[PDB]
Each structure stands twice: as structure tokens, then as C-alpha cells.
Amino acid sequence: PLSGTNVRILADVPFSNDYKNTRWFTSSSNQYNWFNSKSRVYEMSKVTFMGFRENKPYVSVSLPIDKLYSASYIMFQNADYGNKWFYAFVTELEFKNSAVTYVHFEIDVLQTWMFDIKFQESFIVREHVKLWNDDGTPTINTIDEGLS
């Protein structure tokens, strides 16, 4: 995403590029409010992303590698998608000089497009099902787990 507005670099975001775990939200607002609640390491009102070439995309952050260790996440808006929030992983730190630092990123296809996806009928290997009926009687699940 060429340009960015209202940029914030975020710490304390637990999930990573593994996509084994993520935080699921109820509304576009709830999404933003959760992310809003973190301890803000860095802020900018406008940003020109300039990594655009080979692919590593990045940002130029004006604080040394020290104090920037806590960096975990980036959220930013764009002029063309209105007030849609873009969410991105902080993949890598790279050496610039010793007073301003390069903070590179990876757009989170889950968090970003989260409410923009529609899930259709699909074969599902595992999921969490309803366990108990109203009566207190167990729901019927007989699929052979194949477990001792």
C-alpha cells in the first residue's frame, strides 16, 4: 500500500507470521479499539512507504535500534480506502545509521480483510462443536477419532 496516514507502530501483539493463533473480533470498531489499547512505541501522521522494489516493504522510523525492540505491529490508514485500518506484522529490523531506524512490515491478511471475507461451505477437519443439549444430555458426536 503505497502511502499511509495516522500510522502507529505497536508493541505487545502476541500472534505472529505462523498464523496458528490470532485474535478474533466482533466489529470493525472492536478490532480498532483492541489494537488501539496498546502501549504506543511510535506514531506518525503521514508516512511514505518506500521499500517498494524487490518486495521487502518498509517504513523509515526516526528512532535508534535501541528502544525499538518492543516493536511488534503496525497499523495505518490510507487515503484511498477511507478510514479502513490496515494491520501489518513487524517482520524485520535493518541497520540504517545509529539514530533513525528501518521498520519493515508484512500485511496481516487476516486482521486487515477480516470483516471483508465470506466463508462458504467447506470440508472441515476439526472444530469446536456444541457440547450439551438444553436437557443437559450430551450432543451426539460419533465420528471415529481413531484414538486409543
Partner: protein, 133 residues
Amino acid sequence: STAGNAVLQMQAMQAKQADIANIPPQLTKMGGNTAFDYGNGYRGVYVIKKQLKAEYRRSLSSFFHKYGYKINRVKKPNLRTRKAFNYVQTKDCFISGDINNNDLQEIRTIFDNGITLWHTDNIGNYSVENELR
């Protein structure tokens, strides 16, 4: 990540662990006492129609609906039989026509890997009936 091996793994995860015998282990004890049988009204032949549990019907029906039946015969494939979609997977398929053999060779692999062919603009909506005609 082809559609074919995707289905194969799906076949593997719901793989038939055992057949349902339907031979009562108490068959042996049923006769012998005529006074018991005719007293409780056991007489003549009974036709007992059995069908799989509702849970597994849903499961197998849903599967069959999306990816059709197992066929295992050589013929020209049903490409437009259903109203909505046709799943088609082939093995060493033969497709001819006036096309450079490079492209033609790619199309063959496409059907060899499995593909769903849509006939309605609502692509991915598997909730339809998808009947014939």
C-alpha cells in the same frame, strides 16, 4: 495443493474404519421354543429396512454434493449436467483440438488435477440443490 489430493486427504480422514455387520449375535437363541415365539406373535417373515444414522448421512451427503461420486471408468466427462456446478477430476486424460501442444498439455493437467466448473454466476455458493438439466 491441487483439488485432487485435497479430496484424497478428505477421503482419508473419513476413511471407512469398519463395515456394519448387521448380524445379531443373539440370532442363535431365537428359535427352539415354539410356545415362546407364537405367544409373543413371532410368525412368518419380517422385512426390516435399515439405513445409516442421520449424522453420517449429513456427512456423506455433503461430501458427495460438492465433489460427486467415485467413478473409476473411462468415458468422456460430465461437464454440463447440473444446474450449478460440475466437479471433474481425470487421470491421464486426453484432450485434442486445434491448439499448440504446449497449451493443450496444460489443459489436460488442469482436469487431471480436478476442477469445479460453474454454470451460475454465484460461484462458491454450494448451498444450492445443483440438480440435473
